[PDB]
Design a protein around this nucleic acid. Structure first.
Ligand SMILES: [Mg+2]
Ligand SMILES: [Mg+2]
Length: 756
DNA sequence: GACCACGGCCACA
DNA sequence: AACTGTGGCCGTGGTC
């Protein structure tokens, strides 16, 4: 199994290293034959002898063009005559590439910014994280003595905790009577203990939580102070820091540094993303938090150090459990993209797509288009139309069905050969025209993108058959992971075509897919209403809720499957409407805001305040109890009782302040904000106090009793004292609880005045 | 000063 | 999952 690849420099020549895991042993493969290269397009092939001799400087060393080679490749379906430029070292490219482009005899250069180690995986056709081998893992966390106002890593690291299959342990340099604590003389010997432990276990994966921005940075500062060779790498190297935009990421050569924070933040939606909140949301168990003000006091006074050691032990223990949950999914995603788990776990969906396309474009001799320049990106700022959004028939409905399409946009791309290499191609025989936009796509040859989506969805169906026959839950869970990720990948390729900074950007291909989706959707809602007498209540892009007015439950499920047979014979090719599920009742408030309940009792809410993080828990809890009384029993009397009970408890200040916290995220620097809302007002006051507010910080404020602007009365929930503070019960009643529940109860004539 | 567009956030698919 | 795109909603300051 391939873990990752990089390259070292031996006598000036590049040597690819392939970190592998075979037969339960860590191996390293060396390759001294791979040569860096990028392509160039010239006005006249005679200029190759002039373009052979451009030189540039690098580290005071003149860079040369090693050799040239003529090749025929496919640039958007069309064969082109492109020249291949070879170089001695990868870093020779960024020094000479701009001078080659500025040569008058050239038109453009292609595939010049591709990293060497990633280029090796693509050209050699190697796929990481492939195989049956099991990886040995180890999570770790640290604890530091924190004082305000001091520099970063000014205080020493007090405890280092690690956890794996054998359990969790804590290394510390003060005596603590606990069975999992290993005591040490000093901090330096505490650190040196951790290196020896990591070296002995020899883990393939090191699991952290926000270790890209803190743990490795803190250990790096201390190791330089105490003169420690932090040789965590399998080759004796030290942790390497890479820049990830406004942040950093840490590498450990030979191993995989799996930071859970970027993986968890994108795979889950929570109000706060503290390690305690993530653990309780995933495993349903409370994890106790001990703040740095408690760590420092307990350490400097030497009192109650077991309570802090238990927090350190649990940190690494829950980090290991979260690691075993999110890594198999991300490992299969790495096998699909064809890149290392380190890069995949920290990359945007767009970059993952361009990695998949670049690997696929290499297998088909397809020259990759370059990233758009500044001026081209300006011409790509035109907005196109999305999917059909029907204004829902407001109110409560009974006995309904939802019928969706099986992968709407990938099916449209496959069926109609939607691709930038097929758009308006002169001289074909079979054309397909898109509605409204009128774009034509040749079909004599399968397009580049429809071939990939066709190959992907074919594999996905093959995986599902292999999945249901698999007996061991392990591969069944992994096959389920792969067949899942394939669906998201195929749908993500469509969005790539509409992205301004995409290599395979095609606005015409994008809007044509949405135009076809609107046609096929509006036709089925028209067929199901005129032929079978259904009533489409709500529709969004690729599905709709419908029923026959005043019909019986089995009669709905009967004629619904009749309509499915009729519409699937009329749908062309890969397009397919399917039966998703039946639900007894369902309330529809507005666009992208509804809630249904099946015959089993499970309620699925969409878009309502229940699923939003910027709403108080008291308002989300009340709206849920109201929906449970209606969707399950239809007892509107129980719902109006619930609301009046909550408001009275709020009016008497008897509701816990924890349920009244509002969580809003900061997205930019506080100077960029042109409108200062409540969560920005409290953040600016905080920054004046000294605390750093970073883009992405989650603010948790509470509104206090008073008058005027809300921002002038909102304090962070850190500073709320029940003996000293009283929240604005008037605000939470009339601006949170009542507005949220009244949108539903207004369907029964109940006004907010009747809800108090 | 009631009325309103509007940043700003997050959600649906 | 969500770069593509479509919407609901609120606290806030601008308006005449
Ligand atoms: Mg290129
Ligand atoms: Mg890398």
């Amino acid at each position: 199994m391939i873990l990752d690849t990089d390259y070292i420099t031996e006598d000036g020549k590049p040597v690819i290293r392939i970190f592998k895991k075979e037969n339960g042993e860590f191996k390293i493969e060396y390759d001294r034959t791979f040569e860096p290269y990028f392509y160039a397009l010239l006005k006249d092939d005679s200029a190759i002898e002039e373009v052979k001799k451009i030189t540039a400087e690098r580290h005071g060393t003149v860079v040369t063009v090693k050799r040239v080679e003529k090749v025929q490749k496919k640039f958007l379906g069309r064969p082109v005559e492109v020249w291949k430029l070879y170089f001695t070292h990868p870093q020779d490219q960024p020094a000479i590439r701009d001078k080659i482009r500025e040569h008058p005899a050239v038109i453009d250069i292609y595939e010049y910014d591709t990293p060497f180690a990633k280029r090796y995986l693509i050209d050699k056709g190697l796929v990481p994280m492939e195989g049956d081998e099991e990886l040995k893992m180890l999570a770790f966390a640290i604890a530091t003595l924190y004082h305000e106002g001091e520099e970063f890593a000014e205080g020493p690291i007090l405890m280092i905790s690690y956890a794996d299959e054998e359990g969790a342990r804590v290394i510390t340099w003060k005596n603590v009577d606990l069975p999992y604590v290993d005591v040490v003389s000093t901090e330096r010997e505490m650190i040196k203990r951790f290196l020896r432990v990591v070296k002995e276990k020899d883990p393939d994966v090191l699991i952290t939580y926000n270790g890209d921005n803190f743990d490795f940075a803190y250990l790096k500062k201390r190791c330089e102070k105490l003169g420690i060779n932090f040789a965590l790498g399998r080759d004796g190297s030290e942790p390497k820091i890479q820049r990830m935009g406004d942040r950093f990421a840490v590498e450990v050569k030979g191993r995989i540094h799996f930071d859970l924070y970027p993986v968890i933040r994108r795979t889950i939606n929570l109000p706060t993303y503290t390690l305690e909140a993530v653990y309780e949301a995933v495993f349903g168990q409370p994890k106790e938090k001990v703040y740095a003000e408690e760590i420092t006091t307990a350490w400097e006074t030497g009192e109650n150090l077991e309570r802090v050691a238990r927090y350190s032990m649990e940190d690494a223990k829950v980090t290991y459990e979260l690691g075993k949950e999110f890594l198999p999914m991300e490992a299969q995603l790495s096998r699909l993209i064809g890149q290392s788990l380190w890069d995949v776990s920290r990359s945007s969906t767009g970059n993952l797509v361009e990695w998949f396309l670049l690997r696929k474009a290499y297998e088909r001799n397809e020259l990759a288009p370059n990233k758009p320049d500044e001026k081209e990106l300006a011409r790509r700022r035109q907005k196109y139309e999305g999917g059909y959004v029907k204004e829902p028939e407001r109110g409560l409905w009974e006995n309904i069905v939802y019928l969706d399409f099986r992968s709407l946009y990938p099916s449209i791309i496959i069926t109609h050969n939607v691709s930038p290499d097929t758009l308006n191609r002169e001289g074909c025989g079979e054309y397909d025209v898109a509605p409204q936009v009128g774009h034509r796509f040749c079909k004599d040859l399968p397009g580049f993108i429809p071939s990939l989506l066709g190959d992907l969805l074919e594999e996905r169906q093959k995986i599902k058959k292999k999945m249901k026959a698999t007996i061991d839950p392990i591969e069944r869970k992994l096959l389920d992971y792969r067949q899942r990720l394939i669906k998201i990948l195929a749908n993500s390729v469509y969005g790539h075509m509409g992205f301004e900074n995409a290599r395979w950007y095609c606005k015409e291909c994008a809007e044509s897919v949405t135009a076809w989706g609107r046609e096929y959707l509006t036709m089925t809602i028209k067929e199901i209403e005129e032929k079978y007498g259904f009533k489409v209540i709500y529709s969004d892009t690729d599905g709709f809720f419908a029923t026959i007015p005043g019909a019986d439950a089995e009669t709905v499920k009967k004629k619904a499957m009749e309509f499915l047979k009729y519409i699937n014979a009329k749908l062309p090719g890969a397009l397919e409407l399917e039966y998703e599920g039946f639900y007894k009742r369902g309330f529809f408030v507005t666009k992208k805001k509804y809630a249904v309940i099946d015959e089993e009792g499970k309620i699925t809410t969409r878009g309502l305040e229940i699923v939003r993080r910027d709403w108080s828990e008291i308002a989300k809890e009340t709206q849920a109890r109201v929906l449970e009384a209606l969707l399950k029993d239809g007892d509107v009397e129980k719902a109006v009782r619930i609301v009046k009970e909550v408001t009275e408890k709020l009016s008497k200040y008897e509701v816990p302040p924890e349920k009244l916290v509002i969580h809003k995220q900061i997205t930019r620097d506080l100077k960029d904000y042109k409108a200062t809302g409540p969560h920005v007002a409290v953040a600016k006051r905080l920054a004046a106090r000294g605390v750093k507010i970073r883009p992405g910080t989650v603010i948790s404020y509470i509104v206090l009793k008073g008058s005027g602007r809300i921002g002038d009365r909102a304090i962070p929930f850190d500073e709320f004292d029940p003996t000293k503070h009283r929240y604005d019960a008037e605000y939470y009643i009339e601006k949170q609880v009542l507005p949220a529940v009244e949108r539903i109860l207004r369907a029964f004539g109940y006004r907010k005045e009747d809800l108090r």
